Write an enzyme that holds these catalytic residues in place. Sequence first.
Site, PDB file in Angstrom:
ATOM      1  CE  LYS A  51      -4.456   1.729   1.865  1.00 33.30           C
ATOM      2  NZ  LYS A  51      -3.766   3.296   2.008  1.00 33.30           N
ATOM      3  CB  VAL A  56      -0.754  -0.527  -3.931  1.00 37.52           C
ATOM      4  CG1 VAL A  56      -1.345  -1.757  -3.231  1.00 37.52           C
ATOM      5  CG2 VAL A  56      -0.080  -0.890  -5.296  1.00 37.52           C
ATOM      6  CE  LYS A  63     -10.037  -7.764  -4.944  1.00 38.71           C
ATOM      7  NZ  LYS A  63     -10.520  -6.911  -4.044  1.00 38.71           N
ATOM      8  CB  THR A  92     -11.815 -10.394 -24.983  1.00 37.32           C
ATOM      9  OG1 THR A  92     -11.242 -11.347 -23.992  1.00 37.32           O
ATOM     10  CG2 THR A  92     -13.169 -10.323 -24.633  1.00 37.32           C
ATOM     11  CB  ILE A  97     -13.734 -10.829 -30.427  1.00 38.53           C
ATOM     12  CG1 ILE A  97     -14.017 -11.751 -31.719  1.00 38.53           C
ATOM     13  CG2 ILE A  97     -14.700 -11.012 -29.304  1.00 38.53           C
ATOM     14  CD1 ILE A  97     -14.082 -13.049 -31.446  1.00 38.53           C
ATOM     15  NE  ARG A 140       6.400 -12.362 -25.701  1.00 37.53           N
ATOM     16  CZ  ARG A 140       5.966 -11.112 -25.287  1.00 37.53           C
ATOM     17  NH1 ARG A 140       5.000 -10.540 -25.364  1.00 37.53           N
ATOM     18  NH2 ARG A 140       7.140 -10.190 -25.202  1.00 37.53           N
ATOM     19  N   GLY A 180       5.410  -9.144 -28.687  1.00 38.46           N
ATOM     20  CA  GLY A 180       4.203  -9.453 -28.919  1.00 38.46           C
ATOM     21  C   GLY A 180       3.692  -9.345 -30.473  1.00 38.46           C
ATOM     22  CG  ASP A 247       0.318  -2.682 -34.813  1.00 39.62           C
ATOM     23  OD1 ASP A 247      -0.867  -3.200 -35.356  1.00 39.62           O
ATOM     24  OD2 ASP A 247       0.535  -3.126 -33.813  1.00 39.62           O
TER      25      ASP A 247
HETATM   26  O1  DUP Z   1      -3.023   1.601 -25.327  1.00 40.13           O
HETATM   27  C1  DUP Z   1      -2.018   1.959 -26.094  1.00 40.13           C
HETATM   28  C2  DUP Z   1      -1.453   0.724 -26.996  1.00 40.13           C
HETATM   29  C3  DUP Z   1      -0.321   1.154 -27.604  1.00 40.13           C
HETATM   30  N1  DUP Z   1       0.377   2.405 -27.382  1.00 40.13           N
HETATM   31  C4  DUP Z   1       1.803   2.821 -27.764  1.00 40.13           C
HETATM   32  C5  DUP Z   1       3.053   2.303 -26.808  1.00 40.13           C
HETATM   33  C6  DUP Z   1       3.119   1.005 -27.320  1.00 40.13           C
HETATM   34  O2  DUP Z   1       4.494   0.427 -26.972  1.00 40.13           O
HETATM   35  C7  DUP Z   1       3.061   0.919 -28.693  1.00 40.13           C
HETATM   36  C8  DUP Z   1       2.927  -0.237 -29.486  1.00 40.13           C
HETATM   37  O3  DUP Z   1       1.824  -0.771 -29.112  1.00 40.13           O
HETATM   38  P1  DUP Z   1       2.018  -2.567 -28.845  1.00 40.13           P
HETATM   39  O4  DUP Z   1       0.505  -3.089 -28.446  1.00 40.13           O
HETATM   40  O5  DUP Z   1       2.339  -3.239 -30.106  1.00 40.13           O
HETATM   41  N2  DUP Z   1       2.840  -2.712 -27.534  1.00 40.13           N
HETATM   42  P2  DUP Z   1       4.315  -3.178 -27.315  1.00 40.13           P
HETATM   43  O6  DUP Z   1       5.114  -2.930 -28.426  1.00 40.13           O
HETATM   44  O7  DUP Z   1       4.831  -2.109 -26.087  1.00 40.13           O
HETATM   45  O8  DUP Z   1       4.353  -4.445 -26.674  1.00 40.13           O
HETATM   46  P3  DUP Z   1       4.174  -5.872 -27.425  1.00 40.13           P
HETATM   47  O9  DUP Z   1       5.457  -6.609 -27.326  1.00 40.13           O
HETATM   48  O10 DUP Z   1       3.030  -6.445 -26.500  1.00 40.13           O
HETATM   49  O11 DUP Z   1       3.805  -5.464 -28.747  1.00 40.13           O
HETATM   50  O12 DUP Z   1       1.903   1.798 -28.990  1.00 40.13           O
HETATM   51  C9  DUP Z   1      -0.051   3.510 -26.680  1.00 40.13           C
HETATM   52  O13 DUP Z   1       0.489   4.305 -26.390  1.00 40.13           O
HETATM   53  N3  DUP Z   1      -1.451   3.209 -26.118  1.00 40.13           N
HETATM   54 MG    MG Z   2       1.622  -3.119 -31.976  1.00 39.98          MG
HETATM   55 NA    NA Z   3      -9.690  -9.205 -28.994  1.00 37.68          NA
HETATM   56 NA    NA Z   4      -0.510   3.481  -2.153  1.00 35.85          NA
END
Ligand code: DUP
Ligand code: MG
Ligand code: NA
Ligand code: NA
Length: 326
Positions: A51, A56, A63, A92, A97, A140, A180, A247
């Site tokens: 906390k 937190v 929890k 999801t 989705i 990954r 990811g 992306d």
């Molecule tokens: O809610 C969001 C999502 C993404 N972003 C930015 C930061 C993020 O690092 C970048 C790329 O999005 P990803 O969803 O690809 N995330 P990241 O590359 O950090 O991690 P991962 O390995 O999951 O792709 O876009 C935001 O600012 N807000």
């Molecule tokens: Mg991305």
């Molecule tokens: Na989804």
């Molecule tokens: Na706190």
Amino acid sequence: TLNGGITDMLTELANFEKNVSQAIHKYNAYRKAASVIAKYPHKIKSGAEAKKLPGVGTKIAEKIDEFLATGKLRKLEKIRQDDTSSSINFLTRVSGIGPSAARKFVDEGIKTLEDLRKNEDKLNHHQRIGLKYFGDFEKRIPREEMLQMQDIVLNEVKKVDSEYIATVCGSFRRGAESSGDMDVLLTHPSFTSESTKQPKLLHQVVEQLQKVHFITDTLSKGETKFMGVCQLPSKNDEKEYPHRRIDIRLIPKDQYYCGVLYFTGSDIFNKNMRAHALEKGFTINEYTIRPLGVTGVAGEPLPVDSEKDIFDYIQWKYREPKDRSE
DNA sequence: CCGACACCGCATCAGC
DNA sequence: GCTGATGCGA
DNA sequence: GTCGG
Ligand SMILES: O=c1ccn([C@H]2C[C@H](O)[C@@H](COP(=O)(O)NP(=O)(O)OP(=O)(O)O)O2)c(=O)[nH]1
Ligand SMILES: [Mg+2]
Ligand code: NA
Ligand code: NA
Ligand SMILES: [Cl-]
Ligand SMILES: [Cl-]
Ligand SMILES: [Cl-]
Ligand SMILES: [Cl-]
Ligand SMILES: [Mg+2]
């Protein structure tokens, strides 16, 4: 991961509030706590100890005590056994989705991978592709593969026009050993905040990447943002690599630093930094950093010539990409 | 207490 | 067709 | 769910 057990619990709770409760703020609340706790350099011995960290509070504190004592959380023990919540969380996971479409499908009796597959006619384009690569998108991407993907994209982009500049951001730029997906920031001198002297800028690149069979599918595509799928080419008799999410964001050349800052993330780091900016009287987006007039309205863009400049405005000491993984 | 909680592109929809 | 609201990216 | 004023 000294406190992996706890951070996981918080993340599961976060996902539940987001997907089932459709309570976004609780979602971010749990994520913030998971984040601050994840970087805490000690093995948490109690909720009170936790906390003390910002984000937190009392609830998460209790929890954490339950968890430390029993090794579990009844609240989650329950959520896990609720079929509707379980189905919703699962659906999801398919790209495209969300909490809403997930609850809708569950209402229609579509709650399993099998169901989804026999009801493709009930899915939009994105969701259709998300289902197709459900397994693959769960995997990954080793940094080694990111490196190979980077080579292709930069070399292919170069070929289209030597004036294009492609930078791989996201977790990759933060130095992650696995990602990811792959996020690519793109710039070209013909597209600035001042003017777009050349059309189809993003299209041309997407086009080329598709030609060399690197981009296999498209989830969504516009003038400045492409969301699709790609695959590394495999060798003879060599088994195929998994399909990967990619992306691509086309940003004005003169707004590169704000763009690279944004796309490098993490998302939680951006949220924290953007909130701090507001406290300091500024507003930051992927394009610029503007001051905030008393009236609340954003002012004109401040000059930026480095990621560090942005940090300086909000009086934050510069933080390397590798230190922005919150 | 109680309002704020980062920001925005593209797909899809309802109302006109 | 347009525009505004919503969902999802995330 | 947590926080600052
Ligand atoms: O809610 C969001 C999502 C993404 N972003 C930015 C930061 C993020 O690092 C970048 C790329 O999005 P990803 O969803 O690809 N995330 P990241 O590359 O950090 O991690 P991962 O390995 O999951 O792709 O876009 C935001 O600012 N807000
Ligand atoms: Mg991305
Ligand atoms: Na989804
Ligand atoms: Na706190
Ligand atoms: Cl909420
Ligand atoms: Cl649990
Ligand atoms: Cl900039
Ligand atoms: Cl702007
Ligand atoms: Mg990424």
